Each structure stands twice: as structure tokens, then as C-alpha cells.
Design a binder for this molecule. Structure first.
Ligand SMILES: COCc1cc(O)cc2c1O[C@@H](c1ccc(O)cc1)[C@H]1CCC[C@@H]21
Ligand SMILES: COCc1cc(O)cc2c1O[C@@H](c1ccc(O)cc1)[C@H]1CCC[C@@H]21
Lengths: 226, 223
């Protein structure tokens, strides 16, 4: 119970953060992104396994969640590292792209503008490092409805992370009306993260020399299962 | 004053869309599309009745209506289907159960997302008052752009949020549960958004039916 306590939880999520990912480049932009995602997914699995209680859900829910949330989590990570640089998307240490470069590949410019607009909203709200840690965890736990309708366990976990975020916002010292307003503003942004995620998935599956992230993810998920 | 919690909920109540009868004189997708086209007309009227909506720039109004329509229709569908598991009450003469979704390809998947989200609202015992606030929030939170008149949209969205927070408060539950319920409700919005994106994808990937999107744009120019 205590390992899920507001303060410990945030610190545990902190240490659980993924390492920097170097794409290491010897169609192409899409080849870079795809090779980057594949690499991040490996670390995303490790990250999820570090969230207190995640490993104690049925493997079925673990897989359900990971398969449903990956694109949202990657994008949430992207928005957070791009947060202080308007007009830019810091995908990785050797892959910084600005809005315009999104004109090369068709359909990508639209997605970039969604990510840049959602990122601008997090900057305006002045998203805190620990609010970000809670939100990203919530994105994983709230990615799939089915595993909730072990279900008892997922609901408990989702509430723990929410309590943690409510706690984080509380020590912000702001009024009670503002605390509710901030919680609501943060959670309403999840809809936009989900939205950019669906567009990214759609664009990815409408694609035809790049890396097969989804299938590689399923391989990782099976290994996670074995 | 019209944005005050109690007054706002009562105003949203009266603003509710009327029942919509498609009046089939046979394609499921043909019925669905004829229904949506009819609902959209009433959805515009509904939005105009939300206190302050008509005062945003026509730019934001059009912006919000264009991107939220599918989410609002689905939020409406889930609310009327809430007490009947395995079924979707699309309209007074169009009740469809899950399996009828196997006919058209790609639809069963969407029906299951809708039935699952509806299932979740039933479990949370979504109230009429909460539903009225959430649906208004779906419209106001549909597009990020008109927010990043913006001052006006932000204040409007906050007003509806206060109303929901107020609704939850008179629930008489503890403060920890109040935060938990607000959070549980708002997280469901991600799922409504999700079923909405799937429905939009399927509609455009669709191949003897009605062009809802173009008709909506006509209504928007009329607006
Ligand atoms: C294999 O995915 C490539 C990929 C293919 C695609 O069609 C669409 C996308 C892809 O990578 C996603 C991505 C997001 C965050 C990351 O940290 C990494 C990748 C975003 C990047 C821009 C659109 C979307
Ligand atoms: C013109 O829309 C037809 C339509 C075409 C489509 O490809 C997908 C969908 C459509 O109607 C939507 C709808 C939702 C709520 C309503 O009250 C009415 C329609 C949902 C119904 C199931 C999938 C999605």
C-alpha cells in the first residue's frame, strides 16, 4: 500500500524514467522516426514494469495496456522534452525537427501541428516535472477500457496515480477551486494526447523500407509474456 | 449569472436536442448516415444555446463544431444506451445490438468501443446533471487550436468545469472521492475521443449513403 503513497510513487516514477535514446543514423525521416520508436518501445516496457503494481496485474492486462498506449506514451514523452522550444519537436538527442520539415512526408505536417499545439498547452499550464511523471503513468493505465469492464487491481492502481497527481497539485499551494481547475485542465489534455495518438497510428498503418514497429512491439510483448 | 453552476445545468437541460426519427421508408450505414445528418442540425442549435457559445468568434464556433460533432453524437448515443448492455439506442426507431455490427466490416470494432465506454459510465452511475456538463465540455474541449476570443473559450470551459465540480460536490461524498470522481469522468473523455477518431476513420474509409461531413460544412456556412 505504502509503495503507492503520493511521495514515494513520484520518486519511484522518477527513477523509472527511460534513458536517452540515440537513433544513430549511419522515407528517411520516416525511417529515422520508425527506428527511434522501435528503440523507445524497448525502454517503455522496462519503464512500465517499474510502475508499482504494474507487474502484479494479469499478463493479459499488461499486454493490453502496453499495446494500446505505446504511441500515446511516446508522444507524451516527445511533448515533454519539446515543451520549452516552440516550433520544434525534440524526438531524440540527434533528431530535432521543426514544423516545416514535416512538409516533406505527406500527412505528417498535420500530426506535427497537433503535437506542437498540445505541447504549447502544457507549456502554458506550466506542467511540472512531477505532474508530467504522474500523467504519463496515467496514460498507460487508462489506455484500454476493456481490462476494466485483476480489474480490481487496475482500478486501484489508476486511483493511486490519480491521488498522487492530486497530491502534487495540492502542495502547489493554490486554492481549492484552482486545484480542481488544474486537475480538470490536465486531464482534458489527455483527450488531445489520445487524439494525436490515433492520427499517428492511422498515418503509420497507411504507410508503404522503414522499420516495422507494431510487429516488433508484438515480438517484445511475446517475450515480455515468456 | 447564467454561467453559475445551478443555472448553467438547468440551461443545458432545456437545450437538449429533441428525439430524432430517421423514418426509413435499409442499409445500416445508410440509416446511421441519415440519422447523423439529422442530429447535426439539432446539435448546432444545442451549441448555440450553451451560455456564451454564440459570443465566441464565429471562427472558434465553427472550429469547435467541425471537430467535435462525432464525439457529441457518440456521447449522446452512450447516454441513451447506458441502461441497456449489449445494445445501442441510436434513435427511437433504430436500436442495434452488438452482433448487428458484424454485417458491415470495421463497425463491430467501433460498437465494442462504444459498448465498453457506455459500460463504464453505467458503472460510475453517471448522473443526468453530470452528463449535461460532460457533453458541453466535449464541445468546448474539442479543438486545441482556438485556445493556443481564446480568453473567452478558456473562461467558458472553466465555467462548465466548475458546474461539474459543483454537481459532484452536492453528491455528499468525501473530498478524496470528489477528486477521484472528477478524474474518473475526465479520463473517460479520452475514450469518447478515441471512439470518435475510429468512427471518423471508418466514415472516410467508407465506400448509396449520405455525405454527412459535406452536409455539416453546408450547415456551418449557413451558420
Ligand atoms: C515507428 O513510428 C514512426 C512513425 C510512423 C508514422 O507513420 C507516424 C509517426 C511515427 O512516429 C511517431 C513517434 C512519436 C514519438 C516518438 O518518440 C517516436 C515516434 C510520430 C512521429 C510523427 C507522427 C508519428
Ligand atoms: C453518418 O454517420 C454514419 C457513420 C458512418 C461511419 O463510417 C461510422 C459511424 C457512423 O455513425 C456514427 C454515429 C454515432 C452516433 C450517432 O448518434 C449517429 C451516428 C457511429 C455509428 C457507428 C460507427 C460511427
Amino acid at each position: 500500500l505504502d509503495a503507492l503513497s503520493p511521495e514515494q510513487l513520484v520518486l519511484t516514477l522518477l527513477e523509472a524514467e527511460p534513458p536517452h535514446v540515440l537513433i544513430s543514423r549511419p522515407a528517411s525521416m520516416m525511417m529515422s522516426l520508425t527506428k527511434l520508436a522501435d528503440k523507445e518501445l524497448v525502454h517503455m516496457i522496462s519503464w512500465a514494469k517499474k510502475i508499482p503494481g504494474f507487474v502484479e496485474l494479469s499478463l493479459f492486462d499488461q499486454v493490453r495496456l502496453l499495446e494500446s498506449c505505446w504511441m500515446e506514451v511516446l508522444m507524451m514523452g516527445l511533448m515533454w522534452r519539446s515543451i520549452d522550444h516552440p516550433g520544434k519537436l525534440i524526438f531524440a538527442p540527434d533528431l530535432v525537427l521543426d514544423r516545416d520539415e514535416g512538409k516533406c512526408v505527406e500527412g505528417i505536417l498535420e500530426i506535427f501541428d497537433m503535437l506542437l499545439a498540445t505541447t504549447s498547452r502544457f507549456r502554458e499550464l506550466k506542467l511540472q516535472h512531477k505532474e508530467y511523471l504522474c500523467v504519463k503513468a496515467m496514460i498507460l493505465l487508462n489506455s484500454s477500457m476493456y481490462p476494466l469492464v485483476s480489474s480490481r487491481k487496475l482500478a486501484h492502481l489508476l486511483n493511486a496515480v490519480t491521488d498522487a497527481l492530486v497530491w502534487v497539485i495540492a502542495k502547489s499551494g493554490i486554492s481549492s477551486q484552482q486545484q480542481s481547475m488544474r486537475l480538470a485542465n490536465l486531464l482534458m489534455l489527455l483527450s488531445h494526447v489520445r487524439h494525436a495518438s490515433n492520427k499517428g497510428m492511422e498515418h503509420l498503418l497507411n504507410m508503404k523500407n522503414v522499420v516495422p514497429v507494431y510487429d516488433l512491439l508484438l515480438e517484445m510483448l511475446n517475450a515480455h509474456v515468456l
